[PDB]
Design an enzyme around this catalytic site. Structure first.
Site, PDB file in Angstrom:
ATOM      1  N   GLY A   1      38.175  34.569  40.412  1.00 51.63           N
ATOM      2  CA  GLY A   1      38.728  34.232  39.174  1.00 51.63           C
ATOM      3  C   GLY A   1      40.104  34.054  39.339  1.00 51.63           C
ATOM      4  N   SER A   2      41.063  33.822  38.339  1.00 54.29           N
ATOM      5  CA  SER A   2      42.239  33.647  37.988  1.00 54.29           C
ATOM      6  C   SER A   2      42.865  35.063  37.302  1.00 54.29           C
ATOM      7  CB  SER A   2      42.747  32.624  37.384  1.00 54.29           C
ATOM      8  OG  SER A   2      42.290  32.502  36.018  1.00 54.29           O
ATOM      9  N   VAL A   3      44.111  35.447  37.911  1.00 55.03           N
ATOM     10  CA  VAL A   3      44.890  36.447  37.347  1.00 55.03           C
ATOM     11  C   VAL A   3      46.214  36.414  36.621  1.00 55.03           C
ATOM     12  CG1 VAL A   3      45.675  38.763  38.122  1.00 55.03           C
ATOM     13  CG2 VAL A   3      43.892  37.854  39.204  1.00 55.03           C
TER      14      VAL A   3
ATOM     15  N   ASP B   1      39.254  44.788  45.111  1.00 56.87           N
ATOM     16  CA  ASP B   1      37.889  44.064  45.191  1.00 56.87           C
ATOM     17  C   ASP B   1      38.013  42.912  45.745  1.00 56.87           C
ATOM     18  OD1 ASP B   1      39.850  43.265  43.265  1.00 56.87           O
ATOM     19  OD2 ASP B   1      38.394  43.173  41.633  1.00 56.87           O
TER      20      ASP B   1
ATOM     21  N   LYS C   1      42.186  39.732  34.716  1.00 58.85           N
ATOM     22  CA  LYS C   1      41.480  38.883  35.934  1.00 58.85           C
ATOM     23  C   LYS C   1      40.419  38.221  34.933  1.00 58.85           C
ATOM     24  CE  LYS C   1      41.047  41.063  39.701  1.00 58.85           C
ATOM     25  NZ  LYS C   1      40.746  42.185  39.929  1.00 58.85           N
TER      26      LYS C   1
ATOM     27  N   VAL D   1      49.604  34.858  38.117  1.00 62.88           N
ATOM     28  CA  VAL D   1      50.093  35.001  39.561  1.00 62.88           C
ATOM     29  C   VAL D   1      49.248  34.448  40.828  1.00 62.88           C
ATOM     30  CG1 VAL D   1      51.079  37.080  38.536  1.00 62.88           C
ATOM     31  CG2 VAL D   1      48.844  37.177  39.677  1.00 62.88           C
ATOM     32  N   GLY D   2      48.160  33.786  40.344  1.00 64.91           N
ATOM     33  CA  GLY D   2      47.369  33.143  41.510  1.00 64.91           C
ATOM     34  C   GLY D   2      45.782  32.944  41.160  1.00 64.91           C
TER      35      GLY D   2
HETATM   36  O1  LIG Z   1      31.419  44.333  47.883  1.00 62.53           O
HETATM   37  C1  LIG Z   1      32.510  43.730  47.737  1.00 62.53           C
HETATM   38  C2  LIG Z   1      33.349  44.602  46.977  1.00 62.53           C
HETATM   39  C3  LIG Z   1      33.641  44.380  45.456  1.00 62.53           C
HETATM   40  C4  LIG Z   1      34.585  45.257  44.831  1.00 62.53           C
HETATM   41  C5  LIG Z   1      35.027  46.254  45.299  1.00 62.53           C
HETATM   42  C6  LIG Z   1      35.982  47.117  44.593  1.00 62.53           C
HETATM   43  F1  LIG Z   1      37.346  47.117  44.951  1.00 62.53           F
HETATM   44  F2  LIG Z   1      35.896  46.940  43.208  1.00 62.53           F
HETATM   45  F3  LIG Z   1      35.367  48.544  44.798  1.00 62.53           F
HETATM   46  C7  LIG Z   1      34.797  46.548  46.692  1.00 62.53           C
HETATM   47  C8  LIG Z   1      34.023  45.873  47.573  1.00 62.53           C
HETATM   48  N1  LIG Z   1      33.212  42.750  48.401  1.00 62.53           N
HETATM   49  C9  LIG Z   1      32.127  42.055  49.450  1.00 62.53           C
HETATM   50  C10 LIG Z   1      32.268  40.488  49.161  1.00 62.53           C
HETATM   51  C11 LIG Z   1      33.734  40.061  49.139  1.00 62.53           C
HETATM   52  C12 LIG Z   1      34.264  40.758  47.731  1.00 62.53           C
HETATM   53  C13 LIG Z   1      34.648  42.453  48.439  1.00 62.53           C
HETATM   54  C14 LIG Z   1      33.342  40.679  46.612  1.00 62.53           C
HETATM   55  C15 LIG Z   1      34.157  41.020  45.326  1.00 62.53           C
HETATM   56  C16 LIG Z   1      33.373  41.046  44.127  1.00 62.53           C
HETATM   57  C17 LIG Z   1      31.999  40.986  44.189  1.00 62.53           C
HETATM   58  C18 LIG Z   1      31.561  40.597  45.567  1.00 62.53           C
HETATM   59  O2  LIG Z   1      30.191  40.330  45.474  1.00 62.53           O
HETATM   60  N2  LIG Z   1      32.160  40.468  46.639  1.00 62.53           N
HETATM   61  C19 LIG Z   1      31.419  40.415  47.908  1.00 62.53           C
END
Ligand SMILES: O=C(c1ccc(C(F)(F)F)cc1)N1C[C@@H]2C[C@H](C1)c1cccc(=O)n1C2
Ligand SMILES: Nc1ccc2c(NC3CC3)nc(-c3ccccc3)nc2c1
EC number: 2.7.11.24
Length: 334
Positions: A30-32, A159, A47, A26-27
């Site tokens: 990583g990939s999903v 996420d 994912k 779907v896109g």
């Molecule tokens: O801290 C988070 C993050 C990661 C996962 C989740 C969720 F939906 F799993 F709770 C929320 C925020 N983000 C801030 C940035 C960009 C995105 C989103 C992200 C996703 C996964 C890892 C990560 O370090 N980050 C850094």
């Protein structure tokens, strides 16, 4: 151990338990693939993380993503149905697959909207945010592509969304303040809500300077009270020496909109983050009258993010991520 099968999709190979069938890409973090989960009967999203251990920064990222997803247990936040690896042992552990609910679309794809629909959607974002924030977690990247919505208008904070990210970013982040708080996410909600109501990106900056300029047009240049709270010498200079701008009346800006919507926007889009409404407070706002229920707006269990300050080897991050795969307890099905 379940039985795994291999296949190729979009160059990327996939090794999943037979439990998951009909993988469809779907896109492309990583990939999903969308899949059918035979055990639960659900459409799911699988994912495959891209190069989870390419470096300390990736490896910590992978661990961070797993820890966060395993913690999240709330209707308006993406949750983990399953996490698996094809690896028999730590020695061969190279691949992480995350399984979540498959959502219909993202809020980016949803385009304006009815006021009663914006009420329900912003209510749900804030409900999820109260929960995330109560665990002392800050999302930091809220934007329409990180908001999944299904057929039923049920919404989950995601996420990552696999359009400029700067468009939804709190100005204190733009300017690089170090002690920003959870209200950075409230700013983003404000930007998202505005967009849902008017059908236009509230602050479509071409770059970081342009971005701040457009923000300041609407909210006005820092007032005396905010000025004296700014620590950075140059920051203070850059703003004491920009042409002073009045705060706009949001009624003059969001013409047509429900006055309660305008009022909440005023409380969310406060330049000074000390003054900005919290998620818990916004849920009590009159705008959410038909949805607000103080007994059905839970908080999260406490979350240990002490790992964030830790400086570890790539193989240590990999090892801890491996423990987290192993110890995972699937949630009970309905
Ligand atoms: O801290 C988070 C993050 C990661 C996962 C989740 C969720 F939906 F799993 F709770 C929320 C925020 N983000 C801030 C940035 C960009 C995105 C989103 C992200 C996703 C996964 C890892 C990560 O370090 N980050 C850094
Ligand atoms: N109590 C506070 C409240 C808001 C703040 C804010 N936000 C303003 C929109 C820029 N910015 C800054 C800051 C400090 C140093 C360098 C750059 C920014 N500090 C703040 C302290």
């Amino acid at each position: 151990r379940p039985t795994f099968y291999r296949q190729e999709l979009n160059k990327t190979i996939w090794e999943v338990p037979e439990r998951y069938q009909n993988l469809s890409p779907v896109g492309s973090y990583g990939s999903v693939c969308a899949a059918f989960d035979t055990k639960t009967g659900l459409r799911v999203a699988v994912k495959k993380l891209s190069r989870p251990f390419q470096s300390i920064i990736h490896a910590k990222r992978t661990y961070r993503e797993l820890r966060l997803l395993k913690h999240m247990k709330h209707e308006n936040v993406i949750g983990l149905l399953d996490v698996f690896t094809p690896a028999r042992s730590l020695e061969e552990f190279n691949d992480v697959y995350l399984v979540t609910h498959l959502m219909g679309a993202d809020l980016n794809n949803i385009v304006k909207l009815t006021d009663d629909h914006v009420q329900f959607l912003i209510y749900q974002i804030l409900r999820g945010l109260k929960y995330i924030h109560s665990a002392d977690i800050i999302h930091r990247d809220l934007k329409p592509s990180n908001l999944a919505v299904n057929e039923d208008c049920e919404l989950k904070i995601l996420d990552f969304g696999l359009v400029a990210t700067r468009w939804y970013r709190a100005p204190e982040i733009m300017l690089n303040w170090m002690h920003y708080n959870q209200t950075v996410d409230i700013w983003s909600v404000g930007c998202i809500m505005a967009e849902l109501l008017t059908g236009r990106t509230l602050f479509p900056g071409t770059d970081h300077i342009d971005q701040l300029k457009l923000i300041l047009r609407l909210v006005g240049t820092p007032g005396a009270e905010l000025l004296k709270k700014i620590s950075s010498e140059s920051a203070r200079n850059y703003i004491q020496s920009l042409t002073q701008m009045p705060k706009m009346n949001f009624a003059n800006v969001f013409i047509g909109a429900n006055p309660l919507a305008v009022d909440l926007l005023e409380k969310m889009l406060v330049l000074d983050s000390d003054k900005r409404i919290t998620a818990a407070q916004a849920l009590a706002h009159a705008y959410f009258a038909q949805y607000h229920d103080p007994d059905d707006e839970p908080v999260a269990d406490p979350y240990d993010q002490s790992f964030e300050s830790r400086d570890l080897l790539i193989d240590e991050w990999k090892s801890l991520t491996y423990d987290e795969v192993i110890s995972f307890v699937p949630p009970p099905l309905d």
